[PDB]
Design a protein around this ligand. Structure first.
Ligand SMILES: *[C@@H]1O[C@H](CO)[C@@H](O[C@@H]2O[C@H](CO)[C@@H](O)[C@H](O)[C@H]2NC(C)=O)[C@H](O)[C@H]1NC(C)=O
Ligand SMILES: *[C@@H]1O[C@H](CO)[C@@H](O[C@@H]2O[C@H](CO)[C@@H](O)[C@H](O)[C@H]2NC(C)=O)[C@H](O)[C@H]1NC(C)=O
Ligand SMILES: [Ca+2]
Ligand SMILES: [Ca+2]
Ligand SMILES: [Cl-]
Ligand code: NI
Ligand code: NI
Lengths: 377, 191, 386, 191
């Protein structure tokens, strides 16, 4: 039972774009109109994810379409029009964690994109998004991803977007259907309030594959825990079942840097106050240093053991290793000091490079890549 | 039982009204296309919006599909029984029928026409109105005063004037269950 | 402090139409437009009042305009189009106490009135309500009353409308001003919930110029009181200060559930009948009085008592009534003016919901000679359930 | 005493935008008419709406009086300083001013034109856009391949082509503070 409650209260009239790690669109609309019809789409939107896909509108993969997206926190519009692709980015920073209105519309021979009812992109285009087939005009529209492969975008992008949508208007339709089905599916609603970071509810983990090559292992963890024990970071060898390295919490409340079952350092924290703690680690043959909020923890090894624990770690790093965040697979409990899943808010830099949970090989669905809920007072 | 989770409602109202019908359903794995049927026959040229929402992590998981038909100007030809149709592999499911009827205020087929006459001399003015709904009760007015006490009494389709001695006007009201529509005001010029 | 409490709950997002007994409009709008413009006016409406003015739109008193009104609980549209008056009345019942959308538009060569997005009147007209003046197009609009005298309508009507309005949209303007000033002025807001009756909050009364001349005085009061004391109905001789007839509530009794109330039929200072009653149980009750020379009977929920006078006393009171009634007399409802407590048992203001039939005719507070402002004419708030 | 309770706000935006300005006030007795001033001149032809709410049952009691000016399609001749004006007796009152100005994405004065030329022939294309906001940085594209590292810090305004051999295409992006607008794509046919 958590020591710090996080205020996990969702918002019923909202739509979470980040639900599906697959990148499958969260919504797919199929339009069929009798008159020639012009694309208009308005919605309110809020995120910290700097990269992802808001919407797609058009037809076949290599026919004629648009994609509204985020890259480096700014809007980007990709068009293919008759097999000629073009990408355009401009406008203000979007991923600032505040609701704004966004809107795409076809206006004259142009595409107009606005933030807060004020235009940031006006793109010149020859021809229309709607298209004739069997005496009707057709358009497809998808949210939170595209209906084809990121490969074949004008410019590739990691479509996974931890963002929140609300007050949507797709083609001035009145179809309270998305709204209804969001009401009865809380996995489709986003936090009522978001804060920077990535949230782990303790139900699973994420993993990567990273080179650590001579070798080093620098890890910085900006943690705000909801539970006194849990694996923040860990390496793992699929074949030998071993945990060459681990960094966890335990209780009555301290951090631990370990190789295998043996702990190489310890350092206490009052984790259940709800403050951001900065857990930092460094490893390289001869050396092994665990800091916390600037203060160093003293080692549980002579030096004759340390060299012959770092020797094991470097033997493991010549083999392949999965870097894990927020947990571990089932392992012999004699293989590491702590193995339970981390609960709380965490941000990891490995080797002076920030981890993007969207860029993982695997991520449990309930982990939110770029938002944490607030702590409840 | 079938894959439909809600059935098309109805829309009943006057010519020119824009309304919608919608059915929604739940299927397993990539959804089917939902067609509409006027009176058990495929609608080929109709404004529709299908809305698909997957419920699992994947496109192989369950889906909530929902089509909405749009009638923009409700003309009389749009009348009848509507229902949804989905082909699920080698099997054919259909929704419960929704109905679009058309009803509204009376509609004049004849209104009193201006006339000029010597008078005091006989003449007649007409006033015909139809529904639906029926019947439509008529009420005359002379110089914007009703002549009778409620629609239905007294003079109706034809109004005979023994003859006036001074220019006057004549309107016609047409009432049915929905309400009233009032005719042009004929002016009868006298010499 | 009252034995039965009624809800004081108002609706910040609502406009009260019956705010002013003068009949003055609760809002007056004035439009100037560059392009020629069709009138469109939508709003939600709720009332029990069977008669009054919803809105006026157009120009000068005699020029060209429309008035949308209620009469016999149904919509009524009046028009003047160059000196040609005309009126239409139709559609379903409106004054059913339930919210509904009403709209008016200049669509085509017609006026179209809708209730719940479904047309109830198409009136043929040739002409525009917006009038050109100085390169611009003008239109005046006023809610809950007209800008000119009610006699100069096509059909006289009593504009006073105890009705509530919300979600209005005048010509698709985005002017949150009415809304704002309503927030700050609770007098302009209506009861969140309404029920049939007329609420006397007990700060004032109302009165009429009724004739009782042979003679009857018959009164049926349908009441649901808040306080245990107050005047239901009474007659006033303005000259003599006297109170020829009164029907009131009083109490003092002596058990736990303090009964405790009486109704008192009374000529001037002496009672004629007294009847116990349970007014403070939130239920409706029927006090009913029937006088005429020789007879004087007071019923409470269909139950007579027998008098407080010998019969010799009864005549030597009914002859005093007979006398008062030969002269003009004012018929009071819900209280009396300041008078000696020697002239009539109860002089207090009545607190609560009440309806009054007098001589088989139903009193309409809008028709009153005077009607204190806080007395709502055709709606009561509900009872607070603790 | 100055009767104004709230003075005009502002409308800073782009062409075609529609916005309002409102000022309200409170007065004893019948409310006066309120006039709108641009740059000291009363606007004799503007969309306006005056709202008047009486506060007592009396019309000689107080009144709240709003006015909103509507600007249906924003354009430069509207740019300026707005304020309300009322007369009370032979004394006049002016509100504090509000401000309307135009601001948005670049507008194209001149876009690259279609042309036809022989191979290896020198020719020139043009691209002119203005704000506000200034500056406006330009960036040329040939067959959708940006001709420079970033907007502005490249070839601007006039582009000199030494000559082509295949048919090519040319666009030109105008970037300013508010964002970007992109020219029509010009095709240069070669023979
Ligand atoms: C819109 O998307 C739908 C799928 O949601 C496309 O439907 C498929 O299209 C291909 C090519 O015509 C067919 O072979 C498939 O069998 C279709 N599947 C279904 C379920 O209908 C549709 O073609 C797309 N249309 C446009 C204009 O983008
Ligand atoms: C709209 O109503 C206003 C009042 O709010 C009218 O103004 C009055 O008009 C009379 C003439 O009919 C003038 O002599 C008065 O000076 C005005 N009185 C006030 C208090 O302003 C105005 O004429 C009406 N305009 C239209 C087109 O109906
Ligand atoms: Ca992302
Ligand atoms: Ca009334
Ligand atoms: Cl309601
Ligand atoms: Ni009859
Ligand atoms: Ni630069």
């Amino acid at each position: 039972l958590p020591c710090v409650p996080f205020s996990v209260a969702k918002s019923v009239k909202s739509l979470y774009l980040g639900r599906m790690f697959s990148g499958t669109p969260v919504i797919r609309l199929r339009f069929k109109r009798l008159q020639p019809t012009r694309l208009v789409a308005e919605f309110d939107f809020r995120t910290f994810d700097p990269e992802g896909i808001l919407l797609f509108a058009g037809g076949h993969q290599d026919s004629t379409w648009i994609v509204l997206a985020l890259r480096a926190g700014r809007l980007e519009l990709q068009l293919r029009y008759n097999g000629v692709g073009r990408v355009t980015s401009s406008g203000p920073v979007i991923n600032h964690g505040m609701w704004q209105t966004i809107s795409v519309e076809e206006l004259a021979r142009n595409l107009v994109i606005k933030v807060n009812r004020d235009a940031v992109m006006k793109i010149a285009v020859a021809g229309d998004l709607f298209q004739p087939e069997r005496g009707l005009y057709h358009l497809n529209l998808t949210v939170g991803g595209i209906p084809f492969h990121e490969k074949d975008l004008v410019q590739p992008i990691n479509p996974r977007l931890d963002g929140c949508m609300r007050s949507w208007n797709w083609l001035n339709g009145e179809d309270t259907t998305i709204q209804e089905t969001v009401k009865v599916n809380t996995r489709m609603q986003c936090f009522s309030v978001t804060e920077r970071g990535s949230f782990y509810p303790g139900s699973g983990f994420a993993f990567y594959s990273l080179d650590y090559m001579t070798w080093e292992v620098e890890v910085v963890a900006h943690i705000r825990p909801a539970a006194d024990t849990g694996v923040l970071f860990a390496l793992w060898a699929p074949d030998l079942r071993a945990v060459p390295l681990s960094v966890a919490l335990v209780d009555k409340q301290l951090v631990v840097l370990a190789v295998e079952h043996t702990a190489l350092a310890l350092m206490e924290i009052k984790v259940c106050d709800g403050q951001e703690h900065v857990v930092t680690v460094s490893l390289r043959d001869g050396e092994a240093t665990l800091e916390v909020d600037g203060t160093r923890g003293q080692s549980e090894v002579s030096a004759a053991q340390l060299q012959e624990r770092l020797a094991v770690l470097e033997r493991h790093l010549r083999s392949p290793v999965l870097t894990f965040a927020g947990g571990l697979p089932d392992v012999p409990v004699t293989s590491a000091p702590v193995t339970a899943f981390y609960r709380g808010c965490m941000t990891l830099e490995v080797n002076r490079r920030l981890l993007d949970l969207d860029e993982a090989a695997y991520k449990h669905s309930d982990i939110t890549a770029h938002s944490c809920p607030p702590v409840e007072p | 039982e079938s894959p439909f989770v809600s059935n098309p409602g109805n829309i009943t109202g006057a010519r020119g009204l824009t309304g919608t019908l919608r059915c929604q359903l739940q299927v397993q794995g990539e959804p089917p296309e939902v067609h509409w049927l006027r009176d058990g026959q495929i609608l080929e040229l109709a404004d529709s919006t299908q809305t698909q929402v997957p419920l699992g992590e994947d496109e192989q998981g369950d889906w909530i599909v929902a089509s909405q038909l749009r009638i923009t100007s409700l003309q009389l030809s749009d009348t009848g029984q509507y229902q949804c149709l989905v082909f699920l592999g080698h099997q054919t499911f259909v929704s419960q029928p929704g109905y679009v009827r058309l009803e509204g205020l009376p509609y004049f087929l004849e209104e009193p026409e201006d006339r000029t006459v010597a008078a005091n001399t006989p003449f007649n003015l007409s006033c015909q109105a139809q529904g639906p709904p029926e019947p439509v009760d008529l009420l005359w007015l002379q110089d914007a005063v009703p002549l009778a006490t409620a629609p239905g009494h007294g003079p109706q389709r034809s109004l005979h004037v023994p003859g006036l001695n001074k220019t006057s006007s004549f309107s016609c009201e047409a009432h049915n269950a929905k309400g009233v529509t009032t005719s042009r005001t004929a002016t009868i010029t006298v010499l």
